[PDB]
Every structure is written in structure tokens, then in C-alpha cells.
Amino acid sequence: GDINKAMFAIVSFETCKADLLKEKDRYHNLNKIDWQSSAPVNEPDHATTTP
Amino acid sequence: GAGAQATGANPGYRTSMVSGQEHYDVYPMLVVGDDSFTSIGFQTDGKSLK
């Protein structure tokens, strides 16, 4: 019953490659990312208004 | 198997079997021009999903 006691929280959001390259040093393994497969339509769990 | 019946004089083209009889095949070579069709989405309001 308390948000403070929660062990973990998981959030899913939409991003582009420009956002990730905005901070190059923070992220790794950007070369192997399969961009086409992880489209918004290919993940039915995520809820969004993107056409 | 949609083609005409193939005899033993097959020059080398591909073929298949229909009802125990050997027939030729057909291959598409399709060209899709702009604004020719649209997929129809049956949305649930509040989100876009399929």
C-alpha cells in the first residue's frame, strides 16, 4: 500500500535514435539494435495513440 | 499447378503436380502504384492496436 516500499517499477516509452545519441556516453550496444522489429505495432503491451 | 499440362518435352521450366497430373506454374511480378489501396483498421478508441 505504499509507493515508497515498492522494490521496482518498470516504465515503457517511445524514443528515436536521436534521443539516444543526444548522450552518446551513457548508452552502449547501439549498433546491434534491431530497429524495425521493435515498432509500436509489434509490441501489443504498449498503449499509445501513434497511428 | 495453374498452368497448362506439361509433357515430357519440358525445356527446363519449373512444374508441379495436380491430381496426379503434371502442370506448369505461374509467377506474379507485381507492381503497386501509389494511392491504390488502404488497409482498414477497426480501432478501439483511446489507442491504436491490432
* Chain B nearest-CA residue for A41: B49
Collect all residues of chain B within an 8 Å Cβ-Cβ radius of residue A49. 46-48
d(CA B17, CA B36): 35
Answer whether B15's CB lies under 8 Å from B26's CB: no
Residues A47 and A40: their CA atoms lie apart, in Å, by: 9
Query: Distance between CA atoms of A23 and A12, rounded to whole angstroms?
Result: 19
CA distances from B8 to B4, B21, B42 (A): 13, 12, 52
**Cβ-contact A38, A20 below 8 angstroms:** no
Distance to chain A for B34, nearest Cα, Å: 20
- DSSP labels, A1-51: --STT-S---------HHHHHTTTTT----SS--TTTT-TTT-SSS-----
HEC secondary structure over chain B: CCCCECCCCCCCCCEEEECCEEEECCCCCCCCCCCCCCCCCCCCCCCCCC
Kindly list the residues from chain B whose CB atom is less than 8 angstroms away from the CB atom of residue A51.
Answer: 48
Report the structure determination method. Answer: cryo-EM
